[PDB]
Amino acid sequence: LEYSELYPIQNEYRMMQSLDGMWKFQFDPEEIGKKSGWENGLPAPVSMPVPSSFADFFTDHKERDYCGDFWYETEFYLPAEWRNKKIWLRFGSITHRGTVYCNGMEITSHEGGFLPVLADISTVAKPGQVNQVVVKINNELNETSLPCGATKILNNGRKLAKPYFDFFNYSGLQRSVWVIALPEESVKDYSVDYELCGTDALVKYEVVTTGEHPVIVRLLDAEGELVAETEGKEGILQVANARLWEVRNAYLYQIVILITDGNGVLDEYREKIGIRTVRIEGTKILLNDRPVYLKGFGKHEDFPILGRGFHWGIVKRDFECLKWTNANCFRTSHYPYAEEWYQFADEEGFLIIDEVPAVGMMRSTRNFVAAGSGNYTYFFEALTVPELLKSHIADTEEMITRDKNHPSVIAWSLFNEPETITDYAYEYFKEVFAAAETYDFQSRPMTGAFEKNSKPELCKCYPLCDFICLNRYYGWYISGGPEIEEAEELFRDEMDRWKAKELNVPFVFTEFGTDTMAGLHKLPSIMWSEEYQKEYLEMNFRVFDSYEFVQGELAWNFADFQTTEGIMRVDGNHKGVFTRDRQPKAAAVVFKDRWE
Amino acid sequence: LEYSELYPIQNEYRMMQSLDGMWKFQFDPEEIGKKSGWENGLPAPVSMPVPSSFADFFTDHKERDYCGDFWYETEFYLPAEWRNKKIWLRFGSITHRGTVYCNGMEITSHEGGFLPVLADISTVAKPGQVNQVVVKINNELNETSLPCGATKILNNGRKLAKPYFDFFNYSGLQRSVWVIALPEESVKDYSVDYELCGTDALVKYEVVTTGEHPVIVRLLDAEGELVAETEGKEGILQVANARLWEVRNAYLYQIVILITDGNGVLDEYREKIGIRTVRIEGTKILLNDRPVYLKGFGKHEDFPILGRGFHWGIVKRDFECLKWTNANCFRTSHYPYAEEWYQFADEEGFLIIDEVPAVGMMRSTRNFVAYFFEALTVPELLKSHIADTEEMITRDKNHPSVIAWSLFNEPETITDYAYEYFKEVFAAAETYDFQSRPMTGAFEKNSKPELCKCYPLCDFICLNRYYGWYISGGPEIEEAEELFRDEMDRWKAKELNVPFVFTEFGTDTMAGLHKLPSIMWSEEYQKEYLEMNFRVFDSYEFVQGELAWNFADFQTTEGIMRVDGNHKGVFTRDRQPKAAAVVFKDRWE
Numbered sequence A: 001l002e003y004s005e006l007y008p009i010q011n012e013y014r015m016m017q018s019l020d021g022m023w024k025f026q027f028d029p030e031e032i033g034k035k036s037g038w039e040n041g042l043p044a045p046v047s048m049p050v051p052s053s054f055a056d057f058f059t060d061h062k063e064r065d066y067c068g069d070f071w072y073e074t075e076f077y078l079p080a081e082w083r084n085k086k087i088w089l090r091f092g093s094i095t096h097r098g099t100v101y102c103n104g105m106e107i108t109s110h111e112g113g114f115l116p117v118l119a120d121i122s123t124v125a126k127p128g129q130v131n132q133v134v135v136k137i138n139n140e141l142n143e144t145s146l147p148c149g150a151t152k153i154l155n156n157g158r159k160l161a162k163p164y165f166d167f168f169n170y171s172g173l174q175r176s177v178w179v180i181a182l183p184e185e186s187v188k189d190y191s192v193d194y195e196l197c198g199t200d201a202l203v204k205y206e207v208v209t210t211g212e213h214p215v216i217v218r219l220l221d222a223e224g225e226l227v228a229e230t231e232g233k234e235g236i237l238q239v240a241n242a243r244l245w246e247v248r249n250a251y252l253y254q255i256v257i258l259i260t261d262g263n264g265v266l267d268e269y270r271e272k273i274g275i276r277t278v279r280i281e282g283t284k285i286l287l288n289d290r291p292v293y294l295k296g297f298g299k300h301e302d303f304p305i306l307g308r309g310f311h312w313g314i315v316k317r318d319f320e321c322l323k324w325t326n327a328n329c330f331r332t333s334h335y336p337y338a339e340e341w342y343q344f345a346d347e348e349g350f351l352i353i354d355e356v357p358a359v360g361m362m363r364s365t366r367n368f369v370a371a372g373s374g375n376y377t378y379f380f381e382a383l384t385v386p387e388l389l390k391s392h393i394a395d396t397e398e399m400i401t402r403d404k405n406h407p408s409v410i411a412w413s414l415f416n417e418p419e420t421i422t423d424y425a426y427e428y429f430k431e432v433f434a435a436a437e438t439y440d441f442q443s444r445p446m447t448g449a450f451e452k453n454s455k456p457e458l459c460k461c462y463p464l465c466d467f468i469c470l471n472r473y474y475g476w477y478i479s480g481g482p483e484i485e486e487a488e489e490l491f492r493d494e495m496d497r498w499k500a501k502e503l504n505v506p507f508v509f510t511e512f513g514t515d516t517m518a519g520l521h522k523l524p525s526i527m528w529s530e531e532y533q534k535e536y537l538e539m540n541f542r543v544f545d546s547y548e549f550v551q552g553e554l555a556w557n558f559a560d561f562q563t564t565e566g567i568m569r570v571d572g573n574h575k576g577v578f579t580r581d582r583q584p585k586a587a588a589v590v591f592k593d594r595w596e
Numbered sequence B: 001l002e003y004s005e006l007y008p009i010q011n012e013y014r015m016m017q018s019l020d021g022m023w024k025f026q027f028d029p030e031e032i033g034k035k036s037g038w039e040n041g042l043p044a045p046v047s048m049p050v051p052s053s054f055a056d057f058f059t060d061h062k063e064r065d066y067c068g069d070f071w072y073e074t075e076f077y078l079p080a081e082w083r084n085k086k087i088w089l090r091f092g093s094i095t096h097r098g099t100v101y102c103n104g105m106e107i108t109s110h111e112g113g114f115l116p117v118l119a120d121i122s123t124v125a126k127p128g129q130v131n132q133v134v135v136k137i138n139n140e141l142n143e144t145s146l147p148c149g150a151t152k153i154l155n156n157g158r159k160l161a162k163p164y165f166d167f168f169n170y171s172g173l174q175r176s177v178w179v180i181a182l183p184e185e186s187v188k189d190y191s192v193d194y195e196l197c198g199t200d201a202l203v204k205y206e207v208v209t210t211g212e213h214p215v216i217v218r219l220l221d222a223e224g225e226l227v228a229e230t231e232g233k234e235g236i237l238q239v240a241n242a243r244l245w246e247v248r249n250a251y252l253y254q255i256v257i258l259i260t261d262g263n264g265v266l267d268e269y270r271e272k273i274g275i276r277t278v279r280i281e282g283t284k285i286l287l288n289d290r291p292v293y294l295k296g297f298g299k300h301e302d303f304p305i306l307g308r309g310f311h312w313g314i315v316k317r318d319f320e321c322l323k324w325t326n327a328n329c330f331r332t333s334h335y336p337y338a339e340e341w342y343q344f345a346d347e348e349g350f351l352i353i354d355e356v357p358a359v360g361m362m363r364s365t366r367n368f369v370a371y372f373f374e375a376l377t378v379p380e381l382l383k384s385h386i387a388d389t390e391e392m393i394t395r396d397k398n399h400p401s402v403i404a405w406s407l408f409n410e411p412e413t414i415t416d417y418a419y420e421y422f423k424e425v426f427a428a429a430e431t432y433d434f435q436s437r438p439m440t441g442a443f444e445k446n447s448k449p450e451l452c453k454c455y456p457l458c459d460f461i462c463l464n465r466y467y468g469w470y471i472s473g474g475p476e477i478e479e480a481e482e483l484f485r486d487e488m489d490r491w492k493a494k495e496l497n498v499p500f501v502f503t504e505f506g507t508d509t510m511a512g513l514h515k516l517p518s519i520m521w522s523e524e525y526q527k528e529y530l531e532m533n534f535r536v537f538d539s540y541e542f543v544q545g546e547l548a549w550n551f552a553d554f555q556t557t558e559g560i561m562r563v564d565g566n567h568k569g570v571f572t573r574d575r576q577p578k579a580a581a582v583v584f585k586d587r588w589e
């Protein structure tokens, strides 16, 4: 990467100033902004909170559902004392793609809506003056970038996003924005990897800087005491009597990376890390050499009004709920979350399966969204797939570079419900997995979540995985309700087929659930009732517990969340175990009791 | 028919005794009841209310969802004085099909779950003693009887009904049961038809009795005063200064039919009727020679716990709600209702489109759940459909409220096979209806104007459309409106010169789901959808009625698309208005 993914810090060498607040915002349905000079200021803006998704503020459909180009603008005073620094705009994300301007000048563009965008404004920044940032953003969906979908043009020319995925197309500036100042020679990246040696541990590391001066690396314990120190851009820190980062029992050291010229220090980067190992051994997931059974949820970045907008309050409530259920794990379904989620998981000892936004790659869904009105003959995969692969690999590189040093991150999920039953899909995913392994200094477990279409007899992609994640809805989409006994039979039949393959890898259920409307009670239960959610879960548990190789269960979903409206979604997806405002349905206690 | 459809009455000649109450009931999953003497009494019964659907009483899934054979039993004391009367068991209905036994003797069987079953127990009845009735009932769904569906067998032998229709498969004894006594020579049927002559009216009639004795027919006004009298099994009653039965302004005369033996009366049948005419003239629906625009709903027989169980309380609340919306009409979607609904509509001046249970006649839905009219079972289905049609029309023809027959809901209609099938149904209906009143059916969107072969059979055309719900809903609602107008422009271009009535349009709407801007499923979207539909309706002169789907939320089969039944109600299942109810009230005022 031609920029650093490192989270920004404030110290003697590095400065940061938040640009969060009310920005100026303007929709550009006619796509006239750039030729009209909007990069120098929006002509008729409204106010827009940052961070937030824009959609749910408005009271009219066309603004909520807006699809196309739209622009953000703000101004900030740059301290004069930042003069002799490399000055960057850092967006937590720009959803889905955008071009950043500063003081009227084009700085950078980015594709991918869920990872940081770094824009080097050093050459146009005006220290000791007010500066301007303008961002052109686009939220259309296509088949050459993630997540996948289509864009429909309505009779009036109005665009409408048509996802191939089951979540609302929230977009905008959904995460915090900073302007930061770095030393001219700085720490750009580092990687740690761990080895356990009895009571001791080794922290292997690499550091990438933007210069040639010597590097010193120190490790401090949770009290700030020096426990190890070495020199060089590559090395090993030896930690006596190491306090390991444990599941639901975190311990964090602080790594301190210094660039020196002998006379003094040029840069200092510090970050909390946790000494822990993760590996797959047969059907076991080993954390610090001991098996762990994953218990938790797929989540979303989703909350009323804010949409995917980041807020520490959502983090705090969600973790309190997670702990109350006795969970130990979540998957970042279906995109990398704001960095703060991982920082907090590190502190709380939660395990994370970190997922790239490779969702929407199922052919039947694509075809369905094309058949709506209307198309049944024209598709061009041969042309788009190579471009999609490039985008997928780029997002993977960005995710892993951003997240690798979190002790919480124990696995990469490289897809959710793609086509996997052709040799072509194998060749596609082989490249993604190869890239992931190359970018991950730890070479930690890699996986993806498979839809039921990936039958054990047909799937060509599970051998790429270190463990296999299954999304299954036996008792919801398949043989629901009065047919639930048949659902259980079908589920056991499938798992018997997996069993007979004797793959000797762990299986984790990454999704299972039922839409459940809080307050819908029925005796006997019906699909959509709270009681049916409980019974469905009990049936699933009986199945899970029948197979030795099943080593985790992440329910879909932690909480009800927003989707595109339609005949199958009653104000979003109601498969939450909690409501959207984070309160438990009856099924939450079922998990609490089982996971205790 | 070899029995009478006439509603039972109590007078000097006719007696009736209710058998409603707690009956004995037993499921028969192994299908051994008739092999094991159950017709002489159930061996291990539980109690079951009659009238009611059985399903929603139980607390376990297997009892609620029971599909197959199941049995009812009760005992009743027959008064000694009923000796030498013709004694009948009269079930308001037996859902879906069944065999009636009395005192251990097989009496009759019936196919069709929404019309009366008459069982002549004259030869086995024991006057002045306790008597027993046992009924074997079956609620499976097939493609040779209505309504249509399939029956799935789960790997353990357990049956599950798989409807091709969007309502829960409620079954059992859902209507009241009577034992009745009739004279040996009795009035079996009669028919009335009306002609308006200025301020006067003619009531044309025919009477069918079970004997050869003379018949006298009288007409009394609402106060019981004699206004007309004539002799003969066929005749005309002349009514001076007739008080017509009017929309939302009923007036009912009483017809009195006497069989005489010269110096005495052998039988008397009495029923309230209303003098009114209905006809289709060009694009207008004429009631008493004046155009009427139909305003109202499709309903169901559906209420919490009772299921389809009849109760006058449901009738009363529903009619109060209908009146509050300023409605004038409902369709008996998708089966004839209990007779009492029509009696009440007659009193309240509501117009009824009376619908036979010919629903589930779809190939798409059939193929998914399981070329509908090309299947070898079809000749049998046709016979069942015609039988139900004959029964419905014979039962309901003399209600002034009944102004049209709906002979199907959403069948396949785009092949010559379908045309030939429906031609037979319509021909039969015409033979049974003394009034030859308008016949129609409700068409699904698949019946494209360019493809449908069956609309020419209809006196007026009923469309079920969901532009803005199943087609281009939500953010695409402007596209939905364009598509709707495109279709209606295609109908307009045919210049058929017939009225169109929208018999369904609606959106699932969860009470209490509010959103600004609206989303599908919200109360606000229901309002916006309706407003869009009205704009379309009002753009076509030939559109002459709108019946919203549905009056109230109602039970369906469980599934991923039904959140505790169907929520397209304008009212909740307990009969309270969503926001959209006011929209109808204001428009229909």
Ligand SMILES: O=C(O)[C@H]1CNC[C@@H](O)[C@@H]1O
Residues within 6 Å of the ligand: A165, A166, A167, A334, A417, A471, A511, A556, A573, A575
């Ligand atoms: O249908 C569902 O509820 C889930 C199915 N698997 C993918 C999820 O994004 C989706 O939300």
Ligand SMILES: O=C(O)[C@H]1CNC[C@@H](O)[C@@H]1O
Residues within 6 Å of the ligand: B165, B166, B167, B334, B410, B464, B504, B549, B566, B568
């Ligand atoms: O889908 C619906 O809501 C309706 C479609 N037309 C037929 C109705 O029985 C059904 O309930």
